[PDB]
Enzyme design. Structure first.
Site, PDB file in Angstrom:
ATOM      1  N   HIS A 187      -0.919  10.184  -7.515  1.00 50.15           N
ATOM      2  CA  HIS A 187      -0.967  11.619  -7.203  1.00 50.15           C
ATOM      3  C   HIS A 187      -0.331  12.378  -8.368  1.00 50.15           C
ATOM      4  O   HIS A 187       0.847  12.195  -8.659  1.00 50.15           O
ATOM      5  CB  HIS A 187      -0.243  11.920  -5.893  1.00 50.15           C
ATOM      6  CG  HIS A 187      -0.831  11.222  -4.709  1.00 50.15           C
ATOM      7  ND1 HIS A 187      -1.871  11.752  -3.973  1.00 50.15           N
ATOM      8  CD2 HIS A 187      -0.543  10.025  -4.143  1.00 50.15           C
ATOM      9  CE1 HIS A 187      -2.190  10.917  -3.000  1.00 50.15           C
ATOM     10  NE2 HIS A 187      -1.399   9.863  -3.079  1.00 50.15           N
ATOM     11  N   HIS A 189      -4.300   0.992  -1.249  1.00 48.60           N
ATOM     12  CA  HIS A 189      -4.517   1.900  -0.124  1.00 48.60           C
ATOM     13  C   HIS A 189      -5.839   2.657  -0.282  1.00 48.60           C
ATOM     14  O   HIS A 189      -6.371   2.769  -1.387  1.00 48.60           O
ATOM     15  CB  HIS A 189      -3.361   2.900   0.001  1.00 48.60           C
ATOM     16  CG  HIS A 189      -2.182   2.369   0.754  1.00 48.60           C
ATOM     17  ND1 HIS A 189      -0.938   2.970   0.709  1.00 48.60           N
ATOM     18  CD2 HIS A 189      -2.056   1.309   1.589  1.00 48.60           C
ATOM     19  CE1 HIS A 189      -0.098   2.295   1.474  1.00 48.60           C
ATOM     20  NE2 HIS A 189      -0.753   1.286   2.025  1.00 48.60           N
ATOM     21  N   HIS A 241       6.257   0.742  -2.092  1.00 45.54           N
ATOM     22  CA  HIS A 241       5.248   1.533  -1.400  1.00 45.54           C
ATOM     23  C   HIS A 241       4.208   0.610  -0.745  1.00 45.54           C
ATOM     24  O   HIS A 241       3.815   0.810   0.410  1.00 45.54           O
ATOM     25  CB  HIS A 241       4.585   2.522  -2.356  1.00 45.54           C
ATOM     26  CG  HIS A 241       3.584   3.398  -1.678  1.00 45.54           C
ATOM     27  ND1 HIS A 241       3.951   4.449  -0.868  1.00 45.54           N
ATOM     28  CD2 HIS A 241       2.230   3.342  -1.639  1.00 45.54           C
ATOM     29  CE1 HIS A 241       2.864   5.024  -0.379  1.00 45.54           C
ATOM     30  NE2 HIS A 241       1.810   4.369  -0.825  1.00 45.54           N
ATOM     31  N   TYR A 243       7.841   5.443   6.749  1.00 45.98           N
ATOM     32  CA  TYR A 243       8.208   4.030   6.829  1.00 45.98           C
ATOM     33  C   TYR A 243       9.536   3.802   7.542  1.00 45.98           C
ATOM     34  O   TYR A 243      10.494   4.555   7.333  1.00 45.98           O
ATOM     35  CB  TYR A 243       8.352   3.409   5.442  1.00 45.98           C
ATOM     36  CG  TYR A 243       7.090   3.259   4.609  1.00 45.98           C
ATOM     37  CD1 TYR A 243       5.864   3.770   5.021  1.00 45.98           C
ATOM     38  CD2 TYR A 243       7.143   2.579   3.397  1.00 45.98           C
ATOM     39  CE1 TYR A 243       4.727   3.625   4.224  1.00 45.98           C
ATOM     40  CE2 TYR A 243       6.023   2.424   2.606  1.00 45.98           C
ATOM     41  CZ  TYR A 243       4.815   2.938   3.023  1.00 45.98           C
ATOM     42  OH  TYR A 243       3.706   2.766   2.214  1.00 45.98           O
ATOM     43  N   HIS A 278      -2.083   0.679  -6.268  1.00 41.49           N
ATOM     44  CA  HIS A 278      -1.936  -0.072  -5.023  1.00 41.49           C
ATOM     45  C   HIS A 278      -3.181   0.039  -4.140  1.00 41.49           C
ATOM     46  O   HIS A 278      -3.957   0.976  -4.268  1.00 41.49           O
ATOM     47  CB  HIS A 278      -0.672   0.360  -4.251  1.00 41.49           C
ATOM     48  CG  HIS A 278      -0.714   1.744  -3.676  1.00 41.49           C
ATOM     49  ND1 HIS A 278      -0.354   2.861  -4.404  1.00 41.49           N
ATOM     50  CD2 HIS A 278      -0.980   2.184  -2.421  1.00 41.49           C
ATOM     51  CE1 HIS A 278      -0.433   3.932  -3.631  1.00 41.49           C
ATOM     52  NE2 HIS A 278      -0.820   3.549  -2.424  1.00 41.49           N
ATOM     53  N   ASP A 307      -6.790   5.688  -0.478  1.00 46.19           N
ATOM     54  CA  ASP A 307      -6.964   6.831  -1.370  1.00 46.19           C
ATOM     55  C   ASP A 307      -6.779   6.473  -2.841  1.00 46.19           C
ATOM     56  O   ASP A 307      -6.769   7.357  -3.694  1.00 46.19           O
ATOM     57  CB  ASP A 307      -6.035   7.992  -0.979  1.00 46.19           C
ATOM     58  CG  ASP A 307      -4.559   7.632  -1.000  1.00 46.19           C
ATOM     59  OD1 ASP A 307      -4.191   6.441  -0.879  1.00 46.19           O
ATOM     60  OD2 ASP A 307      -3.751   8.581  -1.112  1.00 46.19           O
ATOM     61  N   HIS A 308      -6.682   5.181  -3.150  1.00 40.22           N
ATOM     62  CA  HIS A 308      -6.690   4.765  -4.553  1.00 40.22           C
ATOM     63  C   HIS A 308      -7.687   3.645  -4.825  1.00 40.22           C
ATOM     64  O   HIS A 308      -8.285   3.596  -5.911  1.00 40.22           O
ATOM     65  CB  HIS A 308      -5.276   4.349  -4.982  1.00 40.22           C
ATOM     66  CG  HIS A 308      -4.248   5.388  -4.671  1.00 40.22           C
ATOM     67  ND1 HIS A 308      -4.233   6.627  -5.276  1.00 40.22           N
ATOM     68  CD2 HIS A 308      -3.228   5.388  -3.780  1.00 40.22           C
ATOM     69  CE1 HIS A 308      -3.237   7.341  -4.781  1.00 40.22           C
ATOM     70  NE2 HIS A 308      -2.611   6.611  -3.875  1.00 40.22           N
TER      71      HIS A 308
HETATM   72  O1  LIG Z   1       4.275  11.004  -4.660  1.00 42.73           O
HETATM   73  C1  LIG Z   1       3.664  10.024  -4.394  1.00 42.73           C
HETATM   74  O2  LIG Z   1       3.817   8.998  -4.970  1.00 42.73           O
HETATM   75  C2  LIG Z   1       2.722  10.135  -3.096  1.00 42.73           C
HETATM   76  C3  LIG Z   1       2.267  11.422  -2.726  1.00 42.73           C
HETATM   77  C4  LIG Z   1       1.431  11.588  -1.602  1.00 42.73           C
HETATM   78  C5  LIG Z   1       1.085  10.429  -0.876  1.00 42.73           C
HETATM   79  C6  LIG Z   1       1.615   9.197  -1.311  1.00 42.73           C
HETATM   80  C7  LIG Z   1       1.237   7.982  -0.576  1.00 42.73           C
HETATM   81  O3  LIG Z   1       1.189   8.198   0.772  1.00 42.73           O
HETATM   82  P1  LIG Z   1      -0.525   7.384  -1.199  1.00 42.73           P
HETATM   83  O4  LIG Z   1      -0.279   7.131  -2.669  1.00 42.73           O
HETATM   84  O5  LIG Z   1      -0.799   6.166  -0.347  1.00 42.73           O
HETATM   85  O6  LIG Z   1      -1.419   8.556  -0.880  1.00 42.73           O
HETATM   86  N1  LIG Z   1       2.397   9.080  -2.393  1.00 42.73           N
HETATM   87 ZN   LIG Z   2      -0.274   4.460  -0.590  1.00 41.34          ZN
END
Ligand SMILES: O=C(O)c1cccc([C@@H](O)P(=O)(O)O)n1
Ligand SMILES: [Zn+2]
Ligand SMILES: O=C(O)c1cccc([C@@H](O)P(=O)(O)O)n1
Ligand SMILES: O=C(O)c1cccc([C@@H](O)P(=O)(O)O)n1
Ligand SMILES: O=C(O)c1cccc([C@@H](O)P(=O)(O)O)n1
Ligand SMILES: [Zn+2]
Ligand SMILES: [Zn+2]
Ligand SMILES: [Zn+2]
Lengths: 266, 266, 266, 266
Positions: free
Chosen positions: A224, A85, A159, A190, A83, A87-88
């Site tokens: 993650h 965001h 998400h 959310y 996705h 951090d990806h």
């Molecule tokens: O377990 C998960 O899928 C996970 C863990 C930590 C944070 C998040 C989301 O906030 P990001 O993917 O935008 O960082 N997701």
């Molecule tokens: Zn995310």
């Protein structure tokens, strides 16, 4: 008297930014990101594919690991995303400038990517990154083929509206390994019920739990690693404790149901 | 062992973020930004124009001052820009979402705006902001008319390739006042000579000094008020010490020549 | 020897291009397009909304009819779309340039609009038009409010991935009238089964028949009036023979089932 | 009564659409377009570059000629453009989808390309084509290097604001050959004086004549071969009668002066 607040940077746990050497998952598939952010390199006789890039400051590290694997900037053909965001998809714009790579994404992910994550349905402008354009728009269930490795898109909205699982079949010990790179199923802070920016949010998450549960899935990976119980620092046992797709979806749904109950109370 | 550095936010002097009430410049023209960032509101019988918005976190403050002036979100028709850096175009995306406003800009400013200031010729990804799209592309010397106030674009490339001066004629005490909103002529930390990303940089700055010197200019305003010796906190004498366009251009050229000499030495 | 073929223009039946004067549907809702292409104007005390614009050459005619209704270019606030094909979104770019209007659309419609209908899943580059940018992205079930008229988006993917029904409540004779502007449910020359560009096409059409069947729907309108048995040239009886949403969906599904059977045979 | 006119396709002389086999210009440089539209392939040990693609329907022909030269779709690295009109940038979107190619262009050309040539300063929406995005923005005098061939951009605004000459040095018979691919200097049906959409048009053309006159130029090529007296059908004597850059610029200026005089009279 009081000035407006300074802009606040998107800061993350140190382990999310801790570089690691490439960790092999299957014959052609490697983890090349950081200790706690997934970035998968798939190497084919006809060029390489990257699935996710992590945070914006990870571009040069990714290029270093590609080099270590024998992949030059010109050899990187395709970037895919879980996705869009920060951090990806963080370093995607920079990777496109410094490599031969083109981006394939669904419409929802493409429009968020082109905004650099701004005007997020839940985060507003709090978590932004350099914008990038998609070169190819994909539909649910569409395949993309590179050097004979076939990647299938499975939409799993929630998400983000554009959240996608990517699946492909690699090999290990002469046997096929069906890899599922499933997106986050979290909903951090959310508003779930009656959200004017996402009216069918709950219906979409429920469908996505079902989608993830049913994926072809000998090996599950997540953006993650902790979400699927991977430990990238654990060497030969990095994936030993990994969840099935079924268990990952079940855990996410149980968590989600609890969050819904809390929202109703809170 | 060492993680990659955290992202660093674009932080600025407190005075750049210090809200102020509207300060009248001429019969239809007001400063409505902060103590040290210009944002000009021009009010017409046929809607309002905003020239620059300052930093990203200034959107709501701008809307408050517009309200105080009798301008509702629907009444804002047009946003114009000096240049598309974060501290002048910062809140443009948010203003477009929350008002009726459309953006007019030249091609260079439009492409930088659409990238949210990323891949800057000099700053890289160090100073980014929410991306926005331009609704109208303008050419050098082109006019835009709103409620009978005529705005003319004068390109003055250098600080950014798309740097623009905007001129218009207002009134004060029954007499015309030719207002020149001239862009920055600074080059903060820039490589001036032999810059591969901007090979004609010096030629463009030299032409821009000449352009600024010749503007119709009873009253000069600049995106940083200090550059034209405005003091927005000084009330009735806010503009008393303001430079002419000629003096502003001469000062900028002298500074620039000194920077060139230092670059040659350093 | 033989040159490559000339480009071929998108030509349509004459009635699709036949201008008509405004035809009132309810107290605030008017048909202002052509005899066989719908373009709905909704007039509020707080500006006007346009739903679809028809073909690219219809812009000036639309502006003429708006003028006749008392809507100046500055009064047009919002454009909404059924789907982003040339014969419904054709004049959108030009309308944005000549009016105050901003476009709201879902992600799929926005990306197709920004391509000017090029690289269509089924038509390739055969039916293109001037590209335009969306100002606001909407999610399924999201509402947009203008002058107190509330418009709700109902996604009905199939004819295009971004196909949308728009619903709102107007009045007539002191009683509420729930208007449903439902998109096309046709699949003209489409490969339905096993389409690599649209793998879940059939599943999406089936869901969309159900969506349309269930819309709040005192009065049904469609982008081609013939599809809902409207006759815009029939004056006081223009809407007399109009289908219910239930009958429109049932007819479309029966047609679709027949096309599937023929595709299997052919 | 009378319907609005049908859309009219952009039709051109047959010779503009007449395919030809590759014609060698220098050791690494080939004409691979049609008899009367230039499309230059430059082949390097590190991938290929295409300068212009001609009309939209020429994509497959270009790919055929690349194949004949030993260039697969993956080998095409870079597309450069003279200007972003339909008969030179026509197939760019399709080429990006079907090859590894990325586009480099200046800001003006990039914004026109992204609009698919719509809202042209002179042609309106009369000559449009599939829109495409630029991957890299170049500045005047900037170089791009592929496989050791160095391409330099020389802006020559006029025919379009983004009109560019591209220069590079190839070899022939062991000696360097400085190739100049200079853009059109025509102004077909343009309003030259007092044009509100292009106020400095005449000043820009005059500067561009000077720019073209001074290019490094052992061999001149132009987007329409006739403009530089090339005859692509003339085999071994195809380039025998070619103009120098000086003569091309002088002819264009004389023509332009005559058009100005006629405009004043007419
Ligand atoms: O377990 C998960 O899928 C996970 C863990 C930590 C944070 C998040 C989301 O906030 P990001 O993917 O935008 O960082 N997701
Ligand atoms: Zn995310
Ligand atoms: O004097 C000026 O023109 C000036 C002063 C301070 C800072 C700057 C530029 O760095 P900004 O306009 O991008 O902030 N310019
Ligand atoms: O009945 C309909 O819904 C219908 C009728 C005629 C044509 C079409 C589509 O091809 P368009 O909406 O793209 O023109 N649809
Ligand atoms: O001589 C030229 O430069 C020339 C010749 C014919 C047509 C044109 C322009 O209209 P195009 O390049 O857009 O086709 N230019
Ligand atoms: Zn700046
Ligand atoms: Zn259609
Ligand atoms: Zn042209």
């Amino acid at each position: 008297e009081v000035p407006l607040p300074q802009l606040r940077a998107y800061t993350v746990d140190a382990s999310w930014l801790q570089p690691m050497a490439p960790l092999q998952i299957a014959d052609h598939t490697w983890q090349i990101g950081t200790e706690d952010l997934t970035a998968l390199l798939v190497q084919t006789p006809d060029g390489a594919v990257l699935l996710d890039g992590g945070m914006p400051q990870m571009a040069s590290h990714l290029l270093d690991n590609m080099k270590a694997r024998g992949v030059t900037p010109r050899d990187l053909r395709l970037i895919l995303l879980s996705h869009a965001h920060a951090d990806h998809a963080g370093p995607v714009a920079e990777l496109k400038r410094r490599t031969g790579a083109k981006v394939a994404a669904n419409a929802e992910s493409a429009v968020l990517l082109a905004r650099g994550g701004s005007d997020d349905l839940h985060f507003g402008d709090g978590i932004t990154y350099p914008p990038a354009n998609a070169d190819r728009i994909v539909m649910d269930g569409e395949v993309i083929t590179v050097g004979g490795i076939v990647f299938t898109a499975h939409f799993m909205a929630g998400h983000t509206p554009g959240s996608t699982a990517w699946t492909w079949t690699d090999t290990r010990n002469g046997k096929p390994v069906r890899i599922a790179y499933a997106d986050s199923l979290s909903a951090p802070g959310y508003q779930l019920q009656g959200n004017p920016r996402y009216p069918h949010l709950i219906e979409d998450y429920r469908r996505s739990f079902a989608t993830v549960r049913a994926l072809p899935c000998d090996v599950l990976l997540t953006p993650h690693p902790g979400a699927s119980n991977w430990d990238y620092a654990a060497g030969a046992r990095a994936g030993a404790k990994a969840l099935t797709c079924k268990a990952y979806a079940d855990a996410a749904e149980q968590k989600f149901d609890g969050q819904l109950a809390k929202e109703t109370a809170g």
